[PDB]
């Protein structure tokens, strides 16, 4: 049908590449509200356009607010594609017909807890600022933990009152003793809080920090107080350009209109003019899928299967994209977690013991992971084995299993006192050790060659 595609961009996106279907293509630079109202009222006199696809290059979130308001006052559906206009707002209104793209806070929180589970970081806390929308996050986390297979260890929630005086706020900041910390704050407060924590010394390698997409602002704007290795997830997928986004929006609109035509023919209706409703797409495009991609929405307007991306801060002070999001699952390009020991130039982190053992009946019991919860039972320990696939090729897979026995009891108690760290694994070369023409093998081949450190397994 009559659809208008308006783009407010600084990036050079030209226009020529952009029963009764007509499309409108325009390029806009300014973003002042009077210009928006004037353009909307001018195009509304242009041959009864029902479709409006908008994106923005700036990072101002009031544009989406004004777009939703004008859509409500004109009863015309509007989309958000990029920039502040595509930012997910708090609570839409049934009177409004404005819809967006990207996920809300709850979906991203679920993704974050999935990421935490996939690395077995079961001890954490909760740090929240006075930023609005924190109580919904708290309630969602409380509801999510109580119906989980993990049994997470949660410390008391840290809530800030004002710009921290470092008089009573530091009292709460000291009690944070976990390794994983969850922070929910704006970008301006993040620099202050992170500098405060770095002065408090809670900026160690094990003190991981996780924040939502809110605190990760401009890709170019990167404060120096963010340690190299901050955990962030934002829906900014750079492999998919805005052209695909607007094409998918056109597909959504065409499918919705085509499917709503048969139930009632006279659905597409736009208001006559700015100066001077029974059947619509308001409650109809809940279910929709184009070219396999399920582009369905929720009852509150959100997406069903968004595109979230896991990003971290490399040593080069850049947001490094790592993990994406599948239809429901979570993929990880880097299965083994990098240490990121160098957050800054004042952090000489050094402590870890490569331990290689061999399967011995009463000491090293190798058992498969429990499929019911996909987690090793608490009295076992993580491990891996480079298991070759075929005999023609040397390629193999690092299958992760669970180890127990009698000697493994010794290793656990040693870390309790000496307070060190280990990365347990199994020898694929073979038996304990045999000097084959002045060439060893197995554990001796892993300590003499210094590929490992110690071997808790039984040895003669």
């Amino acid at each position, epitope marked *: 049908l*009559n659809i208008a595609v308006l783009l407010g961009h600084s990036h050079d996106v030209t226009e020529r590449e952009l*029963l*009764d279907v*007509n499309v*409108v293509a*325009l390029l806009m630079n300014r973003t002042d509200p009077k210009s928006l109202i004037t353009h909307v009222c001018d195009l509304m*006199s*242009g*041959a*009864r356009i029902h479709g409006l696809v908008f994106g923005d290059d700036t990072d101002q979130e009031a544009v989406a607010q004004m777009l939703d308001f004008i859509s409500s006052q004109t009863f015309i559906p509007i989309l958000g594609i990029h920039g502040g206009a595509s930012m997910i707002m708090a609570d839409k209104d049934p009177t409004s017909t404005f819809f967006q793209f990207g996920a809300s806070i709850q979906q991203q929180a679920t993704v974050m807890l999935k990421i935490m589970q996939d690395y077995d970081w079961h001890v954490f806390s909760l740090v929240t600022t006075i930023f609005p929308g924190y109580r919904d996050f708290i309630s969602f986390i409380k509801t999510t933990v109580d119906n989980s297979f993990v049994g997470w260890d949660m410390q008391n929630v840290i809530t800030l009152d004002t710009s921290f005086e470092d008089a009573k706020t530091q009292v709460q900041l000291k009690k944070i003793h976990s390794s994983v910390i969850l922070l929910y704050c704006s970008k301006d407060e993040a620099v202050l809080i992170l500098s405060e924590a770095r002065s408090l010394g809670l900026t160690g390698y094990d003190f991981f920090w996780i924040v939502p997409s809110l605190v990760s602002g401009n890709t170019e704007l990167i404060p120096k107080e963010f340690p190299s290795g901050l955990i962030s997830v934002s829906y900014d997928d750079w492999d998919y350009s805005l052209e695909a986004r607007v094409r998918d929006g056109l597909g959504i609109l065409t499918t919705a209109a085509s499917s709503m035509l048969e139930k*009632f*023919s*006279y659905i597409p*209706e736009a208001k*006559a003019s700015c100066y001077g409703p*029974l059947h619509t797409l308001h409650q109809f495009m809940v279910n929709v899928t184009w070219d396999g991609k399920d582009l369905s929405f929720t009852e509150e307007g959100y997406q069903v299967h968004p595109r979230l991306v896991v990003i971290v801060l490399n040593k080069d002070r850049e947001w490094e994209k790592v993990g994406k999001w599948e239809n429901q699952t979570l993929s990880l390009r880097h299965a083994v977690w990098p240490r990121y020991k160098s957050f800054s130039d004042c952090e000489p982190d050094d402590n870890h013991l490569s331990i290689v053992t061999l399967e011995e009946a009463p000491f090293v019991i190798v058992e498969d992971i429990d499929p019911l919860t996909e987690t090793c039972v608490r009295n076992t320990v993580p491990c891996r084995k480079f298991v070759k696939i075929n005999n023609s090729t040397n390629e193999g897979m690092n299958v992760k299993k669970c180890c127990k026995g009698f000697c493994i009891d010794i290793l656990k108690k040693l870390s309790r006192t000496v307070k060190f760290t280990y990365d347990l694994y199994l020898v694929t070369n073979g038996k304990h050790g045999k000097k084959v023409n002045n060439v060893w093998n197995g554990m001796i081949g892993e300590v003499v060659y210094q590929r490992a450190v110690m071997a808790v397994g039984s040895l003669t």
Partner: antibody
Framework: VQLQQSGAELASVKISCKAT????????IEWLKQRPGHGLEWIGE????????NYNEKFKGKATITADTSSNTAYMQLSSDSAVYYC??????????????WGQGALVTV | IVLTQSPASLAVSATISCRAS???????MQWYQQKPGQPPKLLIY???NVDSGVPARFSGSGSGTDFSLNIHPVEEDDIAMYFC?????????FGGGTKLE
């Protein structure tokens, strides 16, 4: 697609415009006045599917347009002017807003 | 929008002009041919594209508020009145008519 209308007239009157070539609930219907001595005018449009109606300021308050979804007919009532009348429909591709299908014409006189 | 065209009557054995008082690169002007006692027939749309099923002898051009129409070669068919219609703003309006002989 073909159109038919009422007969001649000679107070108030009503003129019918019946559709027998398409789905009558999808396209707008426009009324035109073609009083001899000049080109033409424009009165208003009506959508049978939803019933939304718009009128011209010059003819506002004098012409009332109504439609019946059952018999697929268009009714335009002038109250309390002798000119030839036409009811027409656009092609549907939109934007151009041109007139392609034309009626027969009802000649009213006082 | 108010339209005005000259001459009111034309004597040939030709061209037409229609001056107005564009929509993002698109011109909105149409020319209609109306024989006596017959409904109008659309001839040119978008001020540059002819209608399918019509003789190729017709061609038109124009932009802004000054547009013109010319015909060649001359035959018996172009013996009716003509007008120009705008669609940039509702309601539409037509021309003043132009005979031929």
């Amino acid at each position: 697609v073909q159109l038919q209308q009422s007969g001649a007239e000679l107070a108030s009157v009503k003129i019918s415009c019946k559709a027998t070539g398409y789905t009558f609930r999808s396209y707008w219907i426009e009324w035109l006045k073609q009083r001899p001595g000049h080109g033409l005018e424009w009165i208003g449009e009506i959508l049978p599917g939803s019933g939304r109606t718009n009128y011209n300021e010059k003819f506002k308050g004098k012409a009332t347009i109504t439609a019946d979804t059952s018999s697929n007919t268009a009714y335009m009532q002038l109250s309390s002017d002798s000119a030839v009348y036409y009811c027409t429909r656009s092609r549907g591709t939109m934007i151009t807003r041109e007139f392609t299908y034309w009626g027969q014409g009802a000649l009213v006189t006082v | 929008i108010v339209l005005t065209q000259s001459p009111a009557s034309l004597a040939v054995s030709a061209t037409i002009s229609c001056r107005a008082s564009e929509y993002y690169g698109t011109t909105l002007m149409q020319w209609y041919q109306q024989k006596p006692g017959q409904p109008p027939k659309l001839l040119i749309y978008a001020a540059s594209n002819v209608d399918s099923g019509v003789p190729a002898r017709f061609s038109g051009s124009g932009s802004g508020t000054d547009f013109s129409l010319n015909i060649h070669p001359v035959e018996e068919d172009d013996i009716a009145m003509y007008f120009c219609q705008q669609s940039r703003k509702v309601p539409s309006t037509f021309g003043g008519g132009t005979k031929l002989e």
